[PDB]
């Protein structure tokens, strides 16, 4: 939201702190910290700067992160689907693309409720 | 092409004023003022009959020669005060001119022809202002409406200008509109 290598993403362990990034979960955090030489049991308050630099350059060289990844997602949706594919029609109308009961419970896409 | 400057007698006005003017108009004359680069305006009494004949036979912007007490002075009809009701000429402002003056006037545009039956022609400009020498001012400036569909804004630059004449109006000036 402000930084890729947020100097304090949140004061807590690294394995779980790096997951405060739109392209990092628990296993990416673990494999990152393994490829580096950084413990995972250590909080972010106890960081250094060189740690942040190696993390930043590793990430920028290996995998994707907030802005570029989110743009990849939205561009995937729009462009690669199209105006009028099936998954695109259902993205457009705000409904579950992957095959789901729309009859009863598609609320995560449809919204809270519009009872008539 | 030239125009024969029509001949007229022009007695000078002795008493000038509204009483003298009205007495003259009752006598059948016309008050006029000859001015220009003469820079010493003359106040004259034309004859209404022949002056009106000249105007209706050679349009408003007419060259004319004035037997001003023997002298034959060349002039143009610059402006006319004509009454609305009577439509009698009340007064003539005349412009001294000479050979190769390139005066500026407001000449009568005239539409003619006939378009498609399914349309109508509206004249937005009674006249067009132009620059030309003061012996070849056209009596009229014609324009044609034969074979012109609706949506044909005929403007002033699209006119057939004679030789020597020069538009001083803008070509954006709409002259004729062809509509439904």
């Amino acid at each position: 939201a402000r930084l890729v290598g947020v100097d304090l993403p949140r004061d807590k362990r690294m394995e779980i702190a790096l997951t405060y990034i739109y392209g990092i979960g628990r296993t990416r955090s673990n494999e990152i910290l393994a490829a580096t030489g950084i413990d995972k049991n250590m909080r972010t308050k106890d960081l250094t700067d060189d740690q942040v630099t190696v993390l930043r350059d590793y990430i920028e060289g290996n995998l994707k992160v907030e802005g570029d990844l989110r743009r990849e997602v939205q561009a995937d949706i729009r462009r690669k689907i199209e105006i009028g594919c099936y998954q695109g029609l259902r993205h457009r109308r705000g409904l579950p693309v992957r095959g789901q009961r729309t009859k009863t419970n598609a609320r995560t896409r449809k919204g809270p409720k519009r009872t008539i | 092409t030239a125009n024969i400057p029509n001949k007229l007698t022009a007695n000078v006005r002795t008493r000038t004023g509204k009483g003298a003017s009205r007495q003259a108009r009752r006598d059948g004359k016309v008050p006029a003022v000859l001015y220009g680069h003469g820079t010493d305006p003359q106040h004259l009494e034309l004859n209404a009959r022949d002056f009106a004949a000249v105007l209706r036979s050679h349009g408003t912007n007419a060259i004319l020669t004035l037997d001003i007490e023997g002298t034959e002075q060349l002039a143009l009809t610059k402006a006319l005060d004509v009454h609305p009701i009577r439509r009698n000429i009340q007064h003539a402002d005349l412009l001294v001119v000479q050979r190769g003056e390139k005066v500026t006037v407001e000449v009568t545009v005239l539409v003619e022809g006939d378009a498609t039956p399914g349309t109508l022609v509206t004249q937005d400009a009674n006249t067009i202002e132009i620059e030309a020498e003061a012996l070849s001012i056209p009596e009229q400036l014609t324009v044609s409406v034969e074979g012109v569909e609706a949506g044909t804004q005929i403007t002033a630059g699209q006119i057939s200008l004679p030789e020597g004449v020069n538009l001083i109006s803008d070509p954006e000036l709409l002259v004729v509109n062809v509509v439904e």
Partner: protein, 182 residues
């Protein structure tokens, strides 16, 4: 003596580069950075003018000057606004502080904002005076990030002696602005 980095760079090379790109008949026709203004229009202060003090603190810690609290010129029913109330903190910057802030901005803050895909070169008023805007304040290292409770963006404009967007863009890119190629 002790001129700012950006300023000595300017009057050592950038003036000549601008002369070459635009052969100016007179040296005094050369573009130059007149001032930069940081507006921090906070229309959310009308309902409560306690956000203006945070805007003030932020702009001060950024530029180095107490801002001017811009009282509203007019009352607007829709914006919940009366006349005279504190909507906006403005800082004008000239001279050494201007050059220092520009160097800080360019070399620090713009690469510090998230997903910095450049700044638009079309963002010129038509007289070689640039203006862009930001959505937050943490991009400036001068602020303690822990003390940022509310995001508060800004509008930064760089007004120059340039007489057109082209010369303005040349000057800014020469100073080292990130103008993406579009």
């Amino acid at each position: 003596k002790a001129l700012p980095r950006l300023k000595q760079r300017y009057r050592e090379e950038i003036r000549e580069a601008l002369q070459q790109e635009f052969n100016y008949a007179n040296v005094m026709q050369i573009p130059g950075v007149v001032k930069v203004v940081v507006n921090m229009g906070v229309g959310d202060a009308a309902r409560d003018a306690k956000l203006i003090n945070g805007a003030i603190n932020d702009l001060a810690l950024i530029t180095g000057q107490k801002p001017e609290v811009r009282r509203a010129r007019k009352s607007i029913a829709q914006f919940k606004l009366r006349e005279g109330m504190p909507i906006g903190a403005r800082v004008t910057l000239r001279g050494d502080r201007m050059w220092e802030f520009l160097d800080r901005l360019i070399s620090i803050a713009l690469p510090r904002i998230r997903d910095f895909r450049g700044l638009s070169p079309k963002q010129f008023d038509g007289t070689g005076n640039y203006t862009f805007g930001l959505n937050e304040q943490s991009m400036f290292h001068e602020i303690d990030v822990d003390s940022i409770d509310r995001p508060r963006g800004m509008d930064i404009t760089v007004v120059t002696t340039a007489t057109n967007d082209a010369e303005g863009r040349a000057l800014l890119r020469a100073l080292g602005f990130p103008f993406k190629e579009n």
